[PDB]
Amino acid sequence: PKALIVYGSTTGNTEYTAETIARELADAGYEVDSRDAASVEAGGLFEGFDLVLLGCSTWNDDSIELQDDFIPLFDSLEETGAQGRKVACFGCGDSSYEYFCGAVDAIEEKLKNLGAEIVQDGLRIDGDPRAARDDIVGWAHDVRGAI
Numbered sequence: 001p002k003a004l005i006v007y008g009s010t011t012g013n014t015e016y017t018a019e020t021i022a023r024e025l026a027d028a029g030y031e032v033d034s035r036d037a038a039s040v041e042a043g044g045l046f047e048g049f050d051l052v053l054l055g056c057s058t059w060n061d062d063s064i065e066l067q068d069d070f071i072p073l074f075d076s077l078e079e080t081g082a083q084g085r086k087v088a089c090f091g092c093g094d095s096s097y098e099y100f101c102g103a104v105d106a107i108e109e110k111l112k113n114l115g116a117e118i119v120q121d122g123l124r125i126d127g128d129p130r131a132a133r134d135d136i137v138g139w140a141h142d143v144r145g146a147i
């Protein structure tokens with residue numbers, strides 16, 4: 001199976017998360033394509049992928065709390081080929097904030113509205129993902145199993 005991992009990361013937490021997930025998948029036998037949201041084009045992004053994992057950090061704001069690099073993707077999610085696609089979301093945040101990993105909720109909700117198949121509840125990481133290594137690995141483990 002082929003998996004696409006797209007992440008929006010500002011300080012590198014979600015990026016570390018994405019790489020950890022990517023390794024787990026790889027070791028399981030998937031061909032994984034991991035990409036920074038800043039370098040992708042939305043049109044047909046998901047074509048040909050068996051699994052798509054989208055991740056992004058959350059930023060407190062009155063309009064849009066998504067990580068800046070992920071915004072363009074999010075705004076054109078309807079052109080990615082999400083209908084009937086098996087997907088799962090992840091993101092880093094901080095429980096000291098009102099909307100803890102609110103970006104995860106937003107992405108899941110929009111994917112659900114576009115007809116994607118959410119395979120598992122999103123991975124919401126509080127603080128340093130290097131300290132949540134087990135959680136990431138375990139979650140990656142569960143999404144493979146839901147596929």
Ligand SMILES: Cc1cc2nc3c(=O)[nH]c(=O)nc-3n(C[C@H](O)[C@H](O)[C@H](O)COP(=O)(O)O)c2cc1C
Nearest residue numbers: 009010011012013014057058060092093094100101
């Ligand atoms: C100014 C600021 C605002 C933040 N706002 C939120 C927030 O609304 N919700 C959340 O869960 N985390 C929030 N966080 C924490 C970031 O989402 C958290 O640091 C995350 O690890 C960053 O991930 P990244 O390196 O992949 O971008 C904020 C952090 C900063 C510095």
